[PDB]
Design a binder for this molecule. Structure first.
Ligand SMILES: *[C@@H]1O[C@H](CO[C@@H]2O[C@@H](C)[C@@H](O)[C@@H](O)[C@@H]2O)[C@@H](O)[C@H](O[C@@H]2O[C@H](CO)[C@@H](O[C@@H]3O[C@@H](C)[C@@H](O)[C@@H](O)[C@@H]3O)[C@H](O)[C@H]2NC(C)=O)[C@H]1NC(C)=O
Ligand SMILES: *[C@@H]1O[C@H](CO[C@@H]2O[C@@H](C)[C@@H](O)[C@@H](O)[C@@H]2O)[C@@H](O)[C@H](O[C@@H]2O[C@H](CO)[C@@H](O)[C@H](O)[C@H]2NC(C)=O)[C@H]1NC(C)=O
Ligand SMILES: *[C@@H]1O[C@H](CO[C@@H]2O[C@@H](C)[C@@H](O)[C@@H](O)[C@@H]2O)[C@@H](O)[C@H](O[C@@H]2O[C@H](CO)[C@@H](O)[C@H](O)[C@@H]2O)[C@H]1NC(C)=O
Ligand SMILES: *[C@@H]1O[C@H](CO)[C@@H](O[C@@H]2O[C@H](CO)[C@@H](O)[C@H](O)[C@@H]2O)[C@H](O)[C@H]1NC(C)=O
Ligand SMILES: [Ca+2]
Ligand SMILES: [Ca+2]
Ligand SMILES: [Ca+2]
Ligand SMILES: [Ca+2]
Lengths: 395, 398, 396, 396
């Protein structure tokens, strides 16, 4: 019911021996993948440059059964020419510095953010300003690029996640919402008008008492804020969407209408009134990383950090623990659910990269460290409370 | 609890009419007269006595307010007159008279609204005098403005039409919708004023919860099977100009919501399947079955009349619907038997009433004691510093 | 083990061609059989009059191999004369208007209820008052007929199911409990004294949340209440029984002593107190229509509406999902299980009628819409939790 | 028994006229005082440079009856020569740029931080790095100045509040804990060893839901973190104390042992484990700004933002809303309670500066906008739950 599509002991690249032979050109233990998203039998895998020796930040892998496809070599997408790191480390609009979590739209486009920053522990290296890209997946050619101005974000240290707001009819009318978990802000991107602005709000912060974890016997505390945003279907009478959002270090989910997010003058305010609202409590130890809203079912899928699992929730039901169900659980293989994503084919995709092991312990290249699963949404929710045909619980 | 006023209190209900009615056999009986409502308008309070038994001289009545409070055993005056409240001996349809009226509501445009059930519910003998009909009363001149008889296609008798909720336009006042809660046939009848047309909704959520219908007030155990009872409307949505209808059955610990866009739609009412248009809001709490509730337009707070807990609770509609986001603002085990009504006036006050119906129905009703009570409390002042205050943040689990 | 016995593409009757050649004396799409019960190689199939063009409300079919017998012709039972529809529509004591679910007891009698009411879309027509019948099965001769007074139930709108309580010794001492899913009541009938009284309770109602269904990709919601009752074996000392009852729109099962049900004085109360009991929660999407109690094994068989299945439960074991087992499942054929009956031979019987296809989509007469099955109880519960010799999964 | 000591309509400075006439030298509305602290009949008032037109950032007022002293002219302290803002805006270790909340110890010293930064809306101007001063209050001469290195804090943007940990025996052995409400950190200053380090922790952050205010009908939200720290009496043997700390936008109070704060190695951990403990919940709408510990009684006083009030708590009684009492409430005058200090004479001192009227509304210089109050601690707690002899209301 949940199949493991991809797994790695370590990450390897399809680049010239020139790059592999050069000193500190490729360090295996340094290459931690951060996302894997799906598009027509192709899975895009990112390796953010938090370390030296990372040949390509954006990558692709071709799918062929049977699964799991073991240790697939990553090919620098769209071309190694872009994923090359300049030796002079200077700004370049035709180079990809660091990419985290891309998303695929219905228009055969790949959207991502090049942070332009390398978070090497010891030497944080700001190469260039953060940029929003779109790639045509039919032609494998870059379409648009937008550099995010200083007035919205200073560096791009925390721009690790994005949510796409594409009009159902016009494929050109696109907004993008970026979650900054480091500076506790959300950056809205008007693609159509090549404009952007930023929101600041108390709800983008962590909950002081809810940033403590114990995973695989390792304890740690994080202060990471707004991390994921999930958009409902456009309202029939208003055309706007509910933005479900949460901090990494929180057991709470909050909501805001896109009408607020799409409005620049609203961002510039000192006080947002009661535009941003609390949806409610997700449960004990129910801190989530990435969550996604499946349009056809109206079901939100949560990646649960502490519980080493993936849960779901039907949006029509009241937001309550007894109205959510765990669809998958794996204490051995889910160490940190780094990414969750919903494809154009009715599947929920999720990924674990064992980052906690690396950070706080020793990762072992003998074992399989990085995993990618998939599940058919309609099939996975059938019996459960996440099924729209199943009534909510009495509590 | 220590800033809520007991405005009116009776031991019995007496009337102001010609002595020919009062002296005639079975024209008036002490125990048979029970008011189901207390409503406030500009220093005069409308009280109604529905005809559950014989000897009810008048149904819809009015009382003038004068300190000290509580005003003890006031003499009820038939409103708008006695000549619309006079029971016919022939019992034919009186298109200009009032048989049984339950809970009226006061809108912003100085009007009173109520339903003429046209049906008397005497134990042993049920009598359908006339068809159900709704009124509008000019409270300035005391003159009836409109009457509308509801077609058989919507309600058969008017047996359970014991509750009304008003949906008046913010700007215009000719555009008025009404939502009547039928707790007996388990339905909601909607009325379109400007068009003078009415239709009805049937739904599973209008029924009681089989397990949550058992009560025990004053050591008297009983169970009722009554359905949809009260509806409360949020302020119009700035983007859609529609409202959220909050509704619960009498015998339920659950609250449900529905957009007024659905309720105001005739073609939607004739569907056999309403989809996900009606939704569960959530659980009110253990032993939190509510009779009547109201939405305060200014604060955005719903006040619940709690049946089992002998209390009035509040909830800020901005906060998630959960017991820890609710507070009891008034509680009276000795004086509150059955909170039969709750209404919000135009002056920012919560008006709630207990009529001791349980003791009459299942026990002894003594006229030596006080059996009827009307209360009022300042909303902005009673919620200040509680979870119900919009400026106070919501609560969380751990 | 579980076998299909009778299945129809459509239903036709063995009646004069005069009724069949009348202006709409038979419309094929309007005839939906609601029940099928067993007695010594005979099966009674009922077509309640919910539309126009139905010749016979009560019928009979003969069991003759091979199974499943294809498109059997329905023979009006006991006769056509009684099953005939009066064009004058006047109350008639020796006729039959609408019959739902008959039952068969240990004293060779067939028992049913004629509602006397025809629920046609546009015009609901009450022809006569509801009537309970006995039929001597050996002779085919109507034994008794009691008309239910206005004091107990007004219309017979929802008297679609009955459950028989026969004394284990004397056949004259019979109590019949009728389920009313429309007005939310249980009508109790004393066969000897020829009296009756009704019960009203909160537990006969639907559960507001648990009344939505999606069968064959078709969403719908019903407000249907108390639908089926199952009577246990008389307690060896008190000689009373436990009546298990559920609403159609409920996942909950409830229990009541037969001492309370057989008591007229208790029937006129306003508050029954602690008498009616909740047994528990059957499970997610475990709403059931008609269920029966097998006396020999002490096992209840449920017909599950949403799960498209038939399940069982050993009454000795505590009521819990883990202590229950699904004995048959058919997502293709079982759309809505309309009847479940237990014959005198130790078999469980269940039927599907494709009713929701008629109501919300269109019915195809070129496909088999109506199905009846039989299962041997002792063989079917053998390797399951329902076996009285096997221990429970949960001690509760 | 709570008496108002000082009040201003507007703040004025005793300074050469050439400074007052200079272009944007003195803008009355910009001069919002932020602290008033008592030492031997002298109250030190600060005006942090968050706007242009502030002649002097640290000032002194000489207390004399009758109270309240209306519109006292602020005298620059120690002198105007240190307080005067350099036009060229270059760094200078002999200049005071921005001082928020000074504190007086037992050793006749005035301790404060010059943030070195001007938080002017539109252009924040970092003139110099933040520094920590001590001034001998007997001679009015500065005793020491220490620049906080860039490893510990970035700019001094949020170094608006300090707490003294003075050795009960030795005056030369001091630690100062500084709260950074902007970057959510604590800076620890080792006075004897002229060293410093920082602590980062989740508990220094605001609580997302508890940062919404409405004072005087003015709705606003702040994201302000760790604001105040209050130290218990030292352990007789080890001399370690309990540090009571809270964020501005939080209803929760936390504790940590000074054993931890005074440990440079502990501050370099990525994970602090169980060292920082949640003490508990202060009550609905009980967001505190500044609080203080009074050694003689063991009572902590809180300045309450939303409640326009000062509350207290006996540290011996469990930390719970009912174990706390409001000792002073003034909705008219207390608008933003900007400071609370505990002097060497058993008094509690508190201040309201109406900052929120300047920020989100308008300030009228005809009204008294800045107020300073004092109260005798033992007299103010006599009857209340805060009295050490009175029993707790809850065991918790
Ligand atoms: C885009 O957003 C801007 C303001 O942000 C919000 O707008 C709406 C979503 C509302 O929820 C509002 O409360 C919130 O501030 C704004 O440019 C624009 O419309 C706002 O709508 C306000 C209410 O109608 C209105 O406020 C007006 O001005 C203020 C300063 C006062 O004088 C008020 O008395 C007066 O009503 C104003 O048009 C504007 N708000 C502001 C602050 O300028 C909104 N546009 C959309 C949604 O299309
Ligand atoms: C101050 O800082 C160190 C970390 O704090 C604690 O360390 C544990 C002992 C425990 O109390 C935890 O709650 C917390 O993490 C602490 O270890 C240190 O003690 C010294 O630590 C040095 C390195 O960690 C080491 O050289 C010594 O062995 C240890 N000294 C001992 C245990 O006597 C604390 N005290 C200092 C530096 O004086
Ligand atoms: C910050 O990183 C510096 C960069 O040095 C190199 O950068 C890349 C080109 C890679 O090849 C990488 O592997 C190299 O380290 C480091 O200098 C420095 O760490 C140490 O520096 C000394 C002196 O150069 C060197 O001998 C040692 O091996 C280390 O690399 C690092 N500084 C900090 C504080 O993290
Ligand atoms: C009453 O409810 C109807 C539900 O059938 C609404 O119909 C909807 O309207 C759209 C556009 O006209 C159709 O595509 C579709 O029939 C849909 O269900 C109808 O609008 C509504 N009436 C009013 C006045 O709101
Ligand atoms: Ca961080
Ligand atoms: Ca009822
Ligand atoms: Ca029905
Ligand atoms: Ca801040």
């Amino acid at each position: 019911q949940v199949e493991e599509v991809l797994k790695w002991q370590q990450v390897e690249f399809d680049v010239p021996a020139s790059v592999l032979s050069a000193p500190d050109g490729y360090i295996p233990i340094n290459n931690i993948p951060m996302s894997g998203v799906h598009y027509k039998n192709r899975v895009f895998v990112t390796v953010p440059r938090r370390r030296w020796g990372i040949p390509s930040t954006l990558n692709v892998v071709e799918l062929e059964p049977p699964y799991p496809v073991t240790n697939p070599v990553l090919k620098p997408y769209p071309s190694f020419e872009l994923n090359e790191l300049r030796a002079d480390l200077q700004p370049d609009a035709n180079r990809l510095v660091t990419v985290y979590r891309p998303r695929v739209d219905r228009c055969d486009r790949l959207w991502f953010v090049d942070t332009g920053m390398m978070e090497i522990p010891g030497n944080f290296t700001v190469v260039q300003r953060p940029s929003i890209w779109s790639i045509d997946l039919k032609t494998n050619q870059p379409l648009s690029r937008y550099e995010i101005p200083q007035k919205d974000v200073e560096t791009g240290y925390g721009l690790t996640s994005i949510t796409l707001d594409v009009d159902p009819d016009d494929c050109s009318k696109v907004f993008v919402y970026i979650s900054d978990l480091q500076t506790y802000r959300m950056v809205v991107y008007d693609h159509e008008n090549q404009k952007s602005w930023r929101f600041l709000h108390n709800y983008f912060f962590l909950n002081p008492l809810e940033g403590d974890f114990n995973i695989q016997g390792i304890p740690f505390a994080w202060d990471d804020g707004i991390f994921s945003i999930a958009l409902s279907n456009p309202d029939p009478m208003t055309k706007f969407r509910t933005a479900y959002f949460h901090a990494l270090s929180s057991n709470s989910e909050f909501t805001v209408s896109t009408a607020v997010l799409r409005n620049e003058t609203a961002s510039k305010r000192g006080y947002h009134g009661d535009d941003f609202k609390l949806l409610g409590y997700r449960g004990a130890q129910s801190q989530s990383s990435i969550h996604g809203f499946h349009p056809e079912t109206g079901v939100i899928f949560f990646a649960l950090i502490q519980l080493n699992a993936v849960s779901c929730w039907d949006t029509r039901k009241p937001f309550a623990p007894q109205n959510m169900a765990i669809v998958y659980k794996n204490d051995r293989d889910i160490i940190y659910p780094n990414d969750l994503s919903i494809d154009q084919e009715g599947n929920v995709w999720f990924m674990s990269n064992s980052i906690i092991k690396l950070l706080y312990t020793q990762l072992s290249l003998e074992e399989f460290n990085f995993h990618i699963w998939r599940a058919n949404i309609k099939e996975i929710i059938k019996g459960t409370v996440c099924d729209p045909t199943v009534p909510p619980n009495v509590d």
